[PDB]
C-alpha cells in the first residue's frame, strides 16, 4: 500500500513540519485540533482540518477513537503521529494498522521491545553494543544491588526496568532501592528495577538512523544534547563535536547493529552517554522522529520526514552510506518557560512573535503573533536552527539570530539561549567543552531576570 | 589596518544582509537612510543609524559627502557599498580610500577596467578566456569568485540565471545544472585567469553565455557582491560577506580549493511587478508580508508588514532561497514555500515563480534560456 493522504495526529511545530513534508511530497495533508488549538498555524496550513473536540490531551490528541474517526471522516489512508502523544504507543500503532491505514512508524512490536528497558538492553547486548556493567535482568532485592556494587564498584544507578537513584556508598543502597521501587511503581505501575554503573557528568550523544523494512540501515549523523535540564533537552547540535574518529565509528557501527538486531525500521535515534574519560555507553533507542531532527537535516542534507514516508511505503533506502556532515548546526528550543523561575511554564498571549531570518537560519514554529498559550500542552513554541561552516561560525550566527528573536507577551527561555551561546563552558576550546547532562542545573551561573 | 566599525552605504535587503554579517563577525554596524526609509527594517537592525536627509537617491544614498560624513560622525572606519548605488563607482571607492577608510570592494582601477567593455575585452583576451568568434538560445552561467589581495582566487561555485527578462534576473540557481565537468572546468579556470589578469580582489562574479551547442563565451565581470549570492552560500557552504571582510582586512584566502557543492539551491526575487501585466512594476503598500519558513527555506528581506514600495527605488521586497538535496527536491520545496508566501497590498512576481517551478521547460537538461520568458513562456498569469 502507498501513502496517498496523510493525517497528522499531532499539534504545534511538529504538525507544521509534517504538513510541509506532505506538500513537498505532493501528498494531501489533514490537520486535527483540540478546541484550544482551533486557531493554530497547523490547522490553517494543512489541506483540510478536523476538530477533535476536548480541552485536554486526554480528551483530544491522546484519544484513539477520535484520531481514527478523523482519519475515517477525512479519508486519509496514512497517519503520521509526530513525536510525543501516541507516537510511541504500540497499541495505537496496531489500531492504525488494524483499520487498514499506513502507520508511519516502526512495527508495534519494535515499539514494545525498544521501549522496555530490559528488553532493549538484551537487544543491545546481542548486538554487541557498548555497555557499562549492569544486571541483565531486574534485581529481586536490595541484596542483589549491594552485591553488584561490591563486585563492580560505586557509584551505581538504580533504574526502573519498565519506565532513578544514584548510590555512592554501600550503606545508602537499601533506602535508595526502596525509594526507586516505590517511585517506579507510582509512575509506571511496576516496581521492578535494574542496576548499572553510574557515569558522572556525561555527555548525551545520539545517532540518527534511517532504517528500511529490508534490513538496510544508515546513520545520518550524530547529535549532542548535553544541554538538558532534568533530562529535558533545551539545546542540541550536529555533528556531536569533539569526538575521535574511533568514537564516531563505535557509535555509528553499534547503532546499525542494534537496529538490525531489533528488526527495526523507521527514522528513530540510538542514544548514548559518553563518560568523562571518553567511554561510549548505550542509553536507549527512541523509536520515533525526535524533536531535534532538524540539526541533522541541515548538516547531513537529508529530509528525514520524506525518509519516513519512503520507509512506510516499503521502499529500499536510497542512501547507500553514512553521509559526511557539511558545516555545523545548533538548535534552540523556544519554550514558554521562565529560566529566572526554575524554568516554570507560564501561559499567556504571544503578543509579538518576531523570528529571525537570513543566512544560516531555519525556524520551525508552531505559533505566530496572536497565538494563545494555555497550560494544556507542552511549552514548546518553536525551534531556532542555525547552520554555519563550522561550530564557531554556527555559534556566531546563533548569537546574531537569538539577538533578533523577539517574543513578547509571555516568558520564554530565549534569555537562557542568549547566555549559553556565549558561555565559555559551552564554547569550549580546541580540546573540547565543559558541559554535560547536569550542567544547566548544577554549574551554569543563572543570572536570568524573571519575566 | 583592520575593520573595526562598518557603515553600510545602502538600504533594503542588502543592507540587512550586511548588517547581519557584521554582527556575525562581532563588528559594530552603522545604517544610513534617506527620509522615506526612516522606518526600514535595516535602520533599527544596525547598532547605530544615521539620517542622510533627502528624498531621492541623488540627495541621499548617491551623495559622496553625506555617506562620508555619516562615517566620520559614527566613527565607522570601513564602508560596505552593498550592490547598486555606489558599489560600482570607482570615484566613490577612491574617495573612501582618500578619506583614510577601508573600502570593502575592489580597487578603483579594477572597477574602471572591468566596467569598460573594450578594456574588459583586452583583459579577457590576455587571460585567454573563451570569446565569441551566433549564440543559439544561450544560458546565462556565472562563476562566483573569492579573490584576496595576494593573488589567490577560488571559485565558490556557478549559478545559472537564464530565467531573466530583458537582462533582468528573476530566478537563479546553484550550481548551474546540466554541465559537464569539462565545461565547469573551463568556466572555473577562465574566471580565475580573468581575475588575476585584472589584479582583482573581492567577491565578484564572472558571467558567461553558454549556447545550445555547448559553446562558452565570456560576457562580463560584476565587481561587487551580486544579488543572487545566497544560492552559492547555501550550496558552497561559505559566507561570502564574511569573505569580503577578510579580503578588505588584507587576509589571505582561508579557502584553498573550489568547494564541492552540497545539494541544490534556487532563489526567487520577490519584486513588486505584475507578470499578468507584462511584468509592469506596480508600486503599493505592503499590507501583509508573510514569508515562508521551515526546512530548506532562507528569506533575505528588506521589508515588513507596513512597508511601502514606491517607484523611486528598486521593486525588490525580498529574496526567497530554497535549498534541497538535489534539484528535484529544491523544486518540490520551492513549490511548497512559494505556496506559503503571502504578500498583500500590491502585485508581485510570486505567481510567475509558482508557474515556472512547475513548467516542463524549467523542470527539464532543460529548455530555458535568456529569452525564454519573453518568447516561449505561456503566460497564463492573471493580472493583480
Contact status of B128 with chain A (Cβ, < 8 Å): no
For residues A437 and A228, the answer to whether their CB atoms sit within 8 Å is: yes
Instruction: Give the nearest chain A residue to B232 (CA atoms).
Output: A359
Cell numbers representing residue A416 in the block: 537562557
Name the nearest CA neighbour of B351 among B260, B234, B273. B273
What sign has the CA pseudo-torsion A243, A244, A247, A248?
positive
Smallest Cα distance from B261 to chain A, Å: 10
Cα A289–chain centre separation: 7
Method used for this model? X-ray
Contact status of A90 with chain B (Cβ, < 8 Å): no
Interface contact flag, B298 A361, Cβ < 8 Å: yes
Question: Gaps (C–N > 2.5 Å) in chain B: which residues precede them?
Answer: 133, 364
For residues A103 and A97, the answer to whether their CB atoms sit within 8 Å is: yes
Helix (H, G, I), strand (E, B) or coil at A27: coil
Cell numbers representing residue B265 in the block: 539551491
Q: How far apart are CA B158 and CA B148, in angstroms?
A: 19
Binding site of A for ATP, by residue number, is 149-205
**Residue A241: its H or E element:** none
Cell numbers representing residue A316 in the block: 529500499
Interface contact flag, B293 A327, Cβ < 8 Å: no
**Domains of chain A by start residue, with CATH:** 1-86 (3.40.50.20), 87-131+199-451 (3.30.470.20), 132-198 (no CATH)
CB neighbours of residue B109 within 10 Å: 14
Which residues on chain A are in Cβ contact (under 8 Å) with B156?
none
For residues B282 and B347, the answer to whether their CB atoms sit within 8 Å is: yes
Strand spans (E) along chain B: 6-8, 29-33, 48-51, 78-80, 102-103, 139-147, 153-165, 168-174, 205-210, 216-222, 264-271, 273-274, 280-281, 284-285, 288-290, 297-301, 308-309, 316-324, 342-344
What sign has the CA pseudo-torsion B189, B194, B200, B203?
negative
Can you tell me which residue has the cell 482540518? A49
Under 8 Å CB pairs connecting chains A and B tally to 83
Could you tell me which residues come within 8 angstroms of residue A228 by beta carbon, excluding any fewer than 6 positions away? A204, A234, A437, A440
Cα B195–chain centre separation: 18
Name the nearest CA neighbour of B222 among B200, B244, B206, B234. B206
For residues A218 and A277, the answer to whether their CB atoms sit within 8 Å is: no
Contact status of A372 with chain B (Cβ, < 8 Å): no
Cβ burial of B154 (10 Å; 0-12, 13-18, 19+) is buried
Name the nearest CA neighbour of A1 among A315, A263, A316. A315
DSSP category for residue A82: -
Q: How far apart are CA B311 and CA B309, in angstroms?
A: 7
DSSP states of A122-165 as a string? HHHHHTT----SB-SS--SSHHHHHHHHHHH-S-EEEEETT--E
**Residue A272: its H or E element:** strand A269-274
Could you tell me which residues come within 8 angstroms of residue A258 by beta carbon, excluding any fewer than 6 positions away? A123, A124, A127, A129, A264, A270, A282, A285
Interface contact flag, B298 A357, Cβ < 8 Å: yes
Helix (H, G, I), strand (E, B) or coil at B40: coil
Can you tell me which residue has the cell 537499601? A174
Cell numbers representing residue A360 in the block: 544560516
Cβ-defined contacts of A21-26 (< 8 Å, 24+): A21/A303, A21/A305, A21/A306, A21/A309, A21/B295, A22/A47, A23/B335, A23/B336, A23/B339, A24/A303, A24/A306, A24/B329, A24/B332, A24/B333, A24/B335, A24/B336, A25/A306, A25/A309, A25/B332, A26/B332
Which residues on chain B are in Cβ contact (under 8 Å) with A301?
262-263, 325
Which residues on chain A are in Cβ contact (under 8 Å) with B21?
359
What torsion, rounded to 10 degrees, do the Cα atoms B41, B46, B50, B54 define?
-30
Could you tell me which residues come within 8 angstroms of residue B182 by beta carbon, excluding any fewer than 6 positions away? none
Q: How far apart are CA A315 and CA A164, in angstroms?
A: 40
DSSP category for residue A340: G
For residues B191 and B206, the answer to whether their CB atoms sit within 8 Å is: yes
Amino acid at each position: 500500500a502507498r501513502i496517498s493522504k496523510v493525517l497528522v495526529a499531532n499539534r504545534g511545530e511538529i504538525a507544521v513540519r509534517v504538513i510541509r513534508a506532505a506538500r513537498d511530497a505532493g501528498l494531501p495533508s489533514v490537520a486535527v485540533y483540540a478546541e484550544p488549538d482551533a486557531e493554530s498555524p497547523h490547522v490553517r496550513l494543512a489541506d483540510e482540518a478536523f476538530a477533535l473536540g476536548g480541552q485536554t490531551s486526554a480528551e483530544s490528541y491522546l484519544d484513539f477513537a477520535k484520531i481514527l474517526d478523523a482519519a475515517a471522516k477525512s479519508g486519509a489512508n496514512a497517519i503520521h503521529p509526530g513525536y510525543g502523544f501516541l507516537a510511541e504507543n504500540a497499541d495505537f500503532a496496531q489500531a492504525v494498522i488494524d483499520a487498514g491505514l499506513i502507520w508511519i512508524g516502526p512495527s508495534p512490536q519494535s515499539i514494545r521491545d525498544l521501549g522496555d528497558k530490559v528488553t532493549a538492553r538484551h537487544i543491545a547486548a546481542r548486538a554487541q553494543a557498548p555497555l557499562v556493567p549492569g544486571t541483565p535482568d531486574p534485581v529481586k532485592g536490595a541484596d542483589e544491588v549491594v552485591a553488584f556494587a561490591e563486585e563492580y564498584g560505586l557509584p551505581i544507578a538504580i533504574k526502573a526496568a519498565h519506565g532513578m537513584k544514584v548510590a555512592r556508598t554501600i550503606d545508602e543502597i537499601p533506602e535508595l532501592y526502596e525509594s526507586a521501587v516505590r517511585e517506579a511503581t507510582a509512575a509506571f505501575g511496576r516496581g521492578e528495577c535494574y542496576v548499572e554503573r553510574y557515569l558522572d557528568k556525561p555527555r548525551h550523544v545520539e545517532a540518527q538512523v534511517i532504517a528500511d523494512q529490508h534490513g538496510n540501515v544508515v546513520v545520518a549523523g550524530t547529535r549532542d544534547c548535553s544541554l538538558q535540564r532534568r533530562y529535558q533537552k533545551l539545546v542540541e547540535e550536529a555533528p556531536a563535536p569533539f569526538l575521535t574518529d574511533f568514537q564516531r565509528k563505535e557509535i555509528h557501527d553499534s547503532a546499525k547493529r542494534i537496529c538490525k538486531e531489533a528488526h527495526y525500521h523507521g527514522a528513530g535515534t540510538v542514544e548514548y552517554l559518553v563518560g568523562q574519560d571518553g567511554l561510549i555507553s548505550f542509553l536507549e533507542v527512541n523509536t520515533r522522529l525526535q524533536v531535534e531532527h532538524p540539526v541533522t537535516e541541515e548538516t547531513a542534507g537529508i529530509d528525514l520526514v520524506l525518509q519516513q514516508f519512503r520507509i512506510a511505503n516499503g521502499e529500499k533506502l536510497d542512501i547507500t552510506e553514512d553521509p559526511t556532515p557539511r558545516g555545523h548546526a545548533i538548535e534552540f528550543r523556544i519554550n514558554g518557560e521562565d529560566a529566572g523561575r526554575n524554568f516554570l511554564p507560564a501561559p499567556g498571549p504571544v503578543t509579538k512573535f518576531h523570528p529571525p531570518s537570513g543566512p544560516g537560519v531555519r525556524v520551525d514554529s508552531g505559533v505566530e503573533t496572536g497565538s494563545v498559550i494555555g497550560g494544556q500542552f507542552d511549552s514548546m513554541l518553536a525551534k531556532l536552527i542555525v547552520h554555519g561552516a563550522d561550530r564557531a561560525e554556527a555559534l556566531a550566527r546563533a548569537r546574531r539570530a537569538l539577538n533578533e528573536f523577539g517574543v513578547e507577551g509571555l516568558a520564554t527561555v530565549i534569555p537562557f539561549h542568549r547566555a549559553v551561546v556565549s558561555d565559555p563552558a559551552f564554547i569550549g576550546d580546541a580540546n573540547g567543552f565543559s558541559v554535560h547532562t547536569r550542567w544547566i542545573e548544577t554549574e551554569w551561573n543563572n543570572t536570568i531576570e524573571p519575566f
